[PDB]
Assembly symmetry: D3
Homo-oligomer: 150 residues x 6
């Protein structure tokens, strides 16, 4: 449906490099609606829950340590196929292999400093949204631009 | 071969969302020359002729109704391989599947509100140009830049 | 009223330099609505009528010769105080004295190649619009955008 | 270098998709984002924020509009950020705002002015305390040697 | 239309990745690049560059900073390019520079004001001679009919 | 591996069309560090050495003649995988087949006027850097943004 939602986190590197506005603008221009937005410094608990699927992996510690190393801009966007579209707009895991035009393709070089990370699926998105945002922090009335949907 | 021409129409949704300038700029930056331009509200007969290839399709009535629902900005651009190039610059049928960097990839989310449409072939381009424009509305003297062509 | 209109002409230099889209986008982003648009090569009669106030000035011939020397993109924009606003967005007569941020301030260096010219008053706008466009080429209804106007 | 100001992207700015454009302008300028959140203001929050205009005829409509939809509240930090942020926005009448400024580039109606910033340090501190909780604001920052001497 | 000015994107401008942004602004304006190179300025070059301030206490600071890292030196040609380039940059204090100007859009501190241009034709000729060898400057340009009448 | 370097040349057409800043900005935004930069008019000897691999090609003369026909902006960028990344950011040989988002995809239409050319390998990059720049023209002290590499 056109009410699908995804969670996007502009990580510490993205925030430190002043790419917050650039990124938000790309999603606004696309037609997706911002239903949740806030800057915070993630706690270790939040970080470990966010990357829970990788808890047994060697790089787990580094992922958690980095996303908690500084301010992060957390956001939720709503729109048709937003989860898959947001991932396409970001690029692939490795910024160097991402095509120009994509966020990582235009601004990143390292996998561990890949600027932003979005939900990999609807299931993960619903899980992440509930983890990072309280219900009261999410819009309940969403009406995009009627020129966007048939 | 550098005199090839194609027909492009910023549809009602593209105009309503204020994307006319953005789109024209992309083609200008590319090196293509504007040889025809005008804003108009398509009539039903023009729309039905324009979309004649889908006259039997179930979504035909919808295509016609929408393209005639508001102002459209019709354009004709000239340049080497402009027909196929213009299509590549627009993206693919489904905006959600279009790569970032393309017009639809950057601004669209629904197939029925795909922002802009270009001729799919030289054959179609010549037909569409004659259908939407009068001879006197098209430049006869062009010759772009020596910086663009060998 | 919110239905005030002004006439803007991207002159041959602006068109040749590929600034048409850039210019249209600036006015679209501002909130003004395009109600008339077309590219044409002005006739001497049209040019002389357009610059009638300067009929007895030494530079009259030059203004006329230049605006008819190549394609021009004529447009009409509608919105509250659009006449004075469009002039402000363009800059002052001399591009070198125009502040960065304005069209001439950002793109021009010569008075005779000042890219674009807008109506200097509501009276001139109405005169110019009727001169460059036929009634059938102008949108009749626009309906105020709730996000732009009270 | 620790001065802070409160900026609110109004419902019209949010609805027109100008949030990113605006944040980018302040990031590019060199100011640091120390507070950020989207919310739909309540009547009380709106009236307190715009208390200085409470006696004016348009106050009712002003309050009704800012509470009509989502607003993106922000706090930016940097030397002279209060006056600088105002200069970047333009003047009260968007039509009189010079191109290059936010209102100059995007607005046409005084009642749909896109964004509003604190007019003084005193007002900024009041507004910041009104819209944000202490824990929602950064306490770090770390001076950037490329921005300040 | 042969007038020329010297522009130096200082270490802060280079470190902040604004070299392309700045060059693009002058290219779009219609001015022609007739000299360009990145270098790390030496003390003797810097002291001559800021000679008008040699008796002032901040002379040492201006010299130390412009020689602290990579600088992109450029020479642009065009009608009234000296005064125009200054207007495009803004005023000495970036906080007081209007949005739309380089310093107005990107700077916050006087000592980190990103770029500096010649203040007069006399200074431009003097500075161009100090920073560039004749062989590093274009001799063939040819006025663009779309920019000049 | 983060010290890898590549040679990029904005050819006469790219310079003449005013794309130098646009191009440099793209590489700056990506995170790569500018370690060498200068505008010059290549000599025949430099050109023939640069295109040595095509000495027996029928188009060799044309490549040499064009790159020496006007000012060129030569540059060297440093960063992880910069050689392959720079090529990807430029696009493919034929600008018409280059994807929107890439330099050639956004600005070119002719193979012979492809705007910019980058080293095709580390081997070629080191050869080209030594050919176009003296060691003293290249930075030895490099400090990329601290948020770019893990
Ligand atoms: C009152 C002002 C703009 N405004 C908003 N609505 C109106 C209206 N109907 N008539 C006149 N002015 C109006 O918005 C408040 P604000 O949003 O704070 O903008 P400002 O730039 O801070 O302006 P001020 O210093 O006066 O607070
Ligand atoms: C696990 C993934 C990539 N990754 C990030 N760091 C590492 C590492 N050290 N080893 C292997 N993989 C690594 O990072 C999480 P993420 O940055 O979210 O990438 P995604 O957007 O999910 O593709
Ligand atoms: C038939 C085509 C896309 N299309 C494909 N299927 C549909 C549908 N169900 N509703 C609306 N449009 C649809 O629309 C005409 P067009 O707008 O020209 O798109 P194109 O550039 O040709 O891909
Ligand atoms: C008369 C004015 C400027 N002008 C343009 N060319 C000349 C010239 N040769 N001598 C003196 N003035 C000149 O041009 C008309 P215009 O380009 O419309 O400027 P405006 O937007 O009306 O300020
Ligand atoms: C002297 C001027 C500003 N300035 C720069 N640093 C200082 C300082 N510490 N005290 C007083 N003035 C200072 O810097 C030279 P510049 O950066 O070239 O400014 P300009 O573009 O010439 O206006
Ligand atoms: C041989 C290749 C493209 N080319 C292919 N054929 C030609 C031709 N006839 N004229 C000019 N260039 C031609 O040009 C070298 P280059 O411009 O470096 O492209 P590259 O980035 O190496 O792919
Ligand atoms: Mg992930
Ligand atoms: Mg079609
Ligand atoms: Mg005039
Ligand atoms: Mg106020
Ligand atoms: Mg100075
Ligand atoms: Mg090559």
């Amino acid at each position: 449906v056109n009410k699908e939602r995804t969670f996007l986190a502009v990580k510490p590197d993205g925030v430190a490099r002043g790419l917050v506005g650039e990124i938000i603008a790309r999603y606004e221009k696309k037609g997706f609606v911002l239903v949740g937005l806030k800057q915070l410094v993630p706690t270790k608990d939040l970080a470990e829950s966010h990357y829970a699927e990788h808890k047994e992996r060697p790089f787990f510690g580094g992922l958690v340590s980095f996303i908690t190393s500084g301010p992060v801009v957390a956001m939720v966007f709503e729109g048709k196929g937003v989860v898959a579209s947001a991932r396409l707009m970001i690029g692939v895991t490795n910024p160097l292999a991402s095509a120009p035009g994509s966020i990582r393709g235009d601004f990143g070089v390292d996998v561990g400093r890949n600027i932003i990370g979005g939900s990999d699926s609807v299931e993960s998105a619903n899980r992440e949204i509930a983890l990072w945002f309280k219900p009261e922090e999410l819009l309940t009335e969403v009406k995009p631009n009627p020129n966007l949907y048939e």
